[PDB]
Structures are given as C-alpha cells and as structure tokens.
Amino acid sequence: ENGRQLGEVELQCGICTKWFTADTFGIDTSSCLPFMTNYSFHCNVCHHSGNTYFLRKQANLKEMCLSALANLTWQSRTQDEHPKTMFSKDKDIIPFIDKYWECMTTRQRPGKMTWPNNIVKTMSKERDVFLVKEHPDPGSKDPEEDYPKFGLLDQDLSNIGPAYD
Ligand SMILES: [Zn+2]
C-alpha cells in the first residue's frame, strides 16, 4: 500500500512531498530509472502553471551508486529464488552504471573514465547509506574474487528520494 508502486518510475513532489508515478502524467520515462534522486519534481496540483515540473539533474557519484544498488536490490528481491542484498563492485554495480548511464546523466563517455576508480571511496565515506564489505565474512564460502561488495543500509526502498528540505 502506502500509495507506492515500487519498481515503477516514481517521482516525489518537492512541494506536497507525496509520491507519483511518472507515466500517469504522460512523462516520457524511456531514459528514467526507478529509485532516482537526481531531479526536482512538482506535480500539476502544486505547480503554479497547472502542469508538471520535472527538472533532471546530472547524477553525482553517490546518486549513481544509490540508484544502482536500489535497482539491483529490487530486481533480486522480486526475481531471485534467493535474494541478495550485497553486490559486487565489479560484477554488479559498475556494469549497471555502464548499462544505464544515459538514464542518469547526459555526459558523454570519451576515452576511459575515472568514475570506476572512485565509487568505492564514495560509498565507504557514507556508511549511514551504504554497507561496505571488503572481504567475505570469516567462515563464508563466498568467492573472494567478487569482493569488495556493497549494499544499502536501509532496505526500505520507499525511503529513497530527492534531497528536498
Ligand atoms: Zn505536489
């Protein structure tokens, strides 16, 4: 319930703070992702013009990790027999960011980028958002090669949204 459609492209309005499904306004979502925080949105009831306001911003490193992890978590929860909450930096997160780049940013990708080298320190400095695992747990049969691994501290995905005030 909660008036939420998790896994859909949802947008939160910065004025009334309520949640909306983008396509109910006919907003084009071909380059949108569920669990974005890099936008500002006003619904048509709140906005002075009586139309929607949808400002798309360029995702910073933290937003890319967060959206990647939210999406990976969601897919796993709803599609995996045995859902994972911890994901491989190299096998999961980077490939997600690569695949869905254009839904997060309009920056071109000339030559080799530096962002891959920097997401680990991005997540590691925000352990109130991100769970970090450099190595498998003592006793774990987890292959060392998939580490380090990352996850969301908060598993309530409904909590993800833009940093309004
Ligand atoms: Zn509103």
Side-chain angles (χ1 to χ4, degrees):
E1 193 246 318
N2 325 107
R4 298 296 307 269
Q5 295 183 263
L6 304 186
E8 289 311 295
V9 176
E10 304 177 273
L11 300 181
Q12 179 184 13
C13 171
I15 303 172
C16 67
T17 81
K18 301 307 173 187
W19 279 96
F20 299 82
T21 286
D23 62 34
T24 73
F25 298 101
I27 295 153
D28 176 8
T29 57
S30 56
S31 71
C32 284
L33 277 178
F35 306 122
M36 295 180 308
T37 61
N38 58 324
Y39 65 88
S40 178
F41 177 77
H42 296 167
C43 69
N44 73 11
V45 161
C46 288
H47 202 235
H48 69 82
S49 64
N51 297 298
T52 45
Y53 171 80
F54 192 24
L55 168 70
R56 305 263 255 131
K57 302 163 170 189
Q58 310 288 335
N60 61 44
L61 291 166
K62 174 202 187 170
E63 294 163 326
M64 295 173 167
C65 295
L66 179 45
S67 291
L69 281 177
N71 278 276
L72 284 163
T73 302
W74 180 254
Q75 267 81 315
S76 179
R77 173 184 304 180
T78 60
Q79 295 181 12
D80 289 351
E81 183 171 59
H82 299 99
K84 313 183 278 185
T85 56
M86 295 295 125
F87 298 92
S88 167
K89 196 257 295 180
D90 296 332
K91 308 189 170 189
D92 308 305
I93 305 186
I94 289 181
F96 184 100
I97 294 176
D98 269 332
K99 184 183 183 183
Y100 292 102
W101 186 262
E102 313 192 12
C103 300
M104 299 187 297
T105 182
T106 64
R107 297 181 190 84
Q108 302 180 25
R109 302 178 265 180
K112 91 176 190 177
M113 314 286 280
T114 60
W115 67 262
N117 306 315
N118 291 307
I119 56 166
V120 166
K121 74 182 75 166
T122 292
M123 288 178 292
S124 299
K125 59 196 193 61
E126 303 220 33
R127 292 163 189 270
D128 57 329
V129 167
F130 302 99
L131 287 158
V132 180
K133 242 155 62 167
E134 286 86 0
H135 321 275
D137 296 320
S140 173
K141 281 149 165 59
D142 259 30
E144 174 84 70
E145 50 148 346
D146 307 320
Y147 286 72
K149 284 195 183 193
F150 301 80
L152 300 180
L153 195 80
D154 188 343
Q155 291 288 116
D156 191 350
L157 300 181
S158 84
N159 283 339
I160 299 176
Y164 302 120
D165 55 353

